[PDB]
Design a protein around this ligand. Structure first.
Ligand SMILES: [Al+3]
Lengths: 389, 389
């Protein structure tokens, strides 16, 4: 009655974090009901098995697992029938031995192929079904024709299950991986912008300091650890048919590269937070001499990252990043001028080490953000995003 | 004939990168042969299906998928038989309708449960088999007793397939995930040490420069991107039974934390490499004034990281890290003394920004390495590693 309350609030949390989870939870049920009725009213364990194992969250994942299962079952049925014909051809007591030896050799060779990188990222489930169907067809004890009917039945049922799941996955309330990847990048951008604004606010400054530590740390600490997510969403979205704004080739590799550049900014930001959170604290009246330039640079980088998030959600071509970032380079120029003013020769050198480290951090962040903005513009053009602006 | 040569050298590469892949490739074949013979000489499609889908690389993965399939099939057979009894109890034409409605509701609820985090990391395949077996038993058209025999047969065959795979995976040439996680951490440590030694060598300095760029970049660039690997190996090793040096509780969460601290060092190292690889080059005769201290700190950190890798491979308690790191803090003290000597007031400030950035980077790396060494010592004690030394 106590842990039950625990999982009840867990369930409400995981639910209201995303409602499409509940809608997909109903979609799987719909698929099972339709398949059952179609094979009751007009085997059938294969139809329900494949509708459970195929239907996944996105539409890309569903289409990908569906074509994996289909094509693999087709090719495996082919090679299996060929093998069984030759096996029955040779002899009557050697048939089982040469059959089992073929199963061994083929399973071994394929299991080894499951370790290549290019085949691991895309067709791993494909190879798995290859092995499975090969051993299904080759390792039965029926007659000549029974195997042909078994093969055609397995192929047809796999196709029907896969097609039912794909249709349901597209036409009810589709969850495209493309939109999730775009939105994930936009969320990452947004968290980095929140951190940069709060830093440009709080660097030069009991429950409130901890709440601020929450709002400072966990955003970028979740930015850094999103590599498997973006790589997964890319490998799912590449299967998706053209829908909405996306043309035939929407170069997902390039978006993943943009994610990488994001994490580079996030590395430097981690260094910045680690210097903030230190106890070796430089007196504020020393940092006073540099307030306005550093705050200008931080604020402008934050605004530009923000509008970039906007442009990755709305898919609208912008050019204000040129203005915001050129002004940031000008801020770096004025900062360079302030540096030549002999303004930091009157501070003990350990402060100099700390302050110059932080200043160099922010400089690197501004230059990086210039790089990313250029990438996103040419990404909007090659993808031919709306030039409405 | 050309691409064939291509995949042939790919195959030899992926092979001689690790031979246990080939041995496991033979283990799967052995499993298929034994299962086939045991169900031929004395259904059986389920035995071969479960031996293919269960048997994975490690021993942890095999045991985990095995217990997932087993326990899920047991519980699902139970609830399925209960449901079918009640369904046949109510009526004779409403039986199919209330059956299909139960299938719908249960499949939907479970598919939603597949989105919790704690259930995703461990029992996702478990929930999948839950749905699958529930729809197998509940959605057949047999009589009262046929379902009981179907349920017992499915349970027994799943158990036999799982047990055969587990035994083969343990007793032939086991691939423990524990040893792989320890060795992976040791390899990460080793690459960071190689970089630190080469940096302390080359910071103060046509085919050779590119080969050195190879040996500088790709090591740490593969350190950073190993988060899914270490999290995966932990989630596999937690299932493993106590073997070798590992006691009952070997706190894998703590080793994963040590991996995290590694990547923190790797972030700063990425910054260092990005400053090396720049074209905005400080004249060497300026960096001359700081050679011996920076080289001392780098070399000592490299030695300590190296011996830490040794201690994570051999599993032997060491204490030389205290000496190597205390000497590094003393090097930082002497560096502090050199800084108060007014030694850098005779350099244009942009050089000052660059040099102070690099010096602060190395300081952070030394402090971080002190933290990691403390963690690994108390990790050797709580795990009760051999105190031989
Ligand atoms: Al099956």
């Amino acid at each position: 009655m106590e842990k039950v309350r625990e999982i009840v609030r867990e369930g409400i949390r995981v639910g209201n974090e995303d409602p499409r989870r509940i809608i997909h939870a109903f979609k799987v049920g719909l698929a099972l009901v339709l398949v059952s009725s179609f094979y009751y009213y007009q085997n059938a364990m294969w139809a329900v098995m494949t509708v459970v194992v195929v239907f996944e969250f996105s539409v890309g994942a569903t289409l990908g697992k569906g074509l994996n299962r289909g094509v693999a079952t087709l090719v495996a049925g082919g090679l299996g029938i060929g093998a069984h014909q030759l096996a029955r051809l040779s002899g009557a007591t050697v048939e089982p031995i040469l059959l089992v030896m073929l199963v061994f050799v083929q399973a071994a060779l394929s299991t080894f192929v499951r370790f290549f990188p290019w085949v691991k990222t895309k067709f791993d489930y494909g190879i798995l079904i290859f092995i499975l169907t090969f051993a299904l067809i080759s390792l039965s004890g029926f007659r000549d024709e029974e195997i042909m009917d078994l093969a055609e039945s397995r192929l047809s049922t796999v196709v029907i299950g896969g097609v039912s799941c794909i249709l349901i996955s597209i036409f009810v309330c589709p969850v495209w991986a493309g939109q999730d990847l775009h939105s994930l990048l936009a969320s990452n951008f947004d968290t980095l912008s929140h951190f940069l604004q709060d830093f440009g606010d709080e660097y030069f400054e009991d429950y409130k300091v901890v709440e601020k530590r929450k709002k400072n740390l966990e955003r970028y600490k979740s930015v850094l650890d999103s590599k498997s997510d973006e790589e997964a969403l890319a490998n799912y979205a590449e299967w998706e048919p053209p829908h909405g704004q996306f043309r035939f080739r929407h170069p997902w590799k390039q978006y993943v590269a943009v994610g990488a550049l994001l994490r580079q900014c996030a590395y430097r930001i981690d260094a910045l937070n680690s210097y903030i959170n230190s106890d070796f604290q430089i007196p504020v009246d020393i940092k006073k001499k540099l307030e306005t330039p550093l705050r200008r640079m931080s604020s402008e980088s934050g605004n530009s990252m923000k509008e970039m998030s906007i442009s990755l959600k709305q898919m609208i071509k912008s050019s204000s990043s040129d203005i915001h970032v050129s002004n940031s380079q000008a801020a770096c120029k004025s900062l360079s001028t302030l540096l030549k003013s002999g303004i930091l020769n009157d501070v003990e050198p350990l402060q100099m080490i700390s302050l110059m480290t932080t200043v160099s951090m922010l400089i690197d962040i501004v230059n990086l953000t210039e790089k990313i903005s250029e990438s996103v513009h040419e990404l909007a053009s090659a993808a031919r995003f709306k030039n409405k602006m």
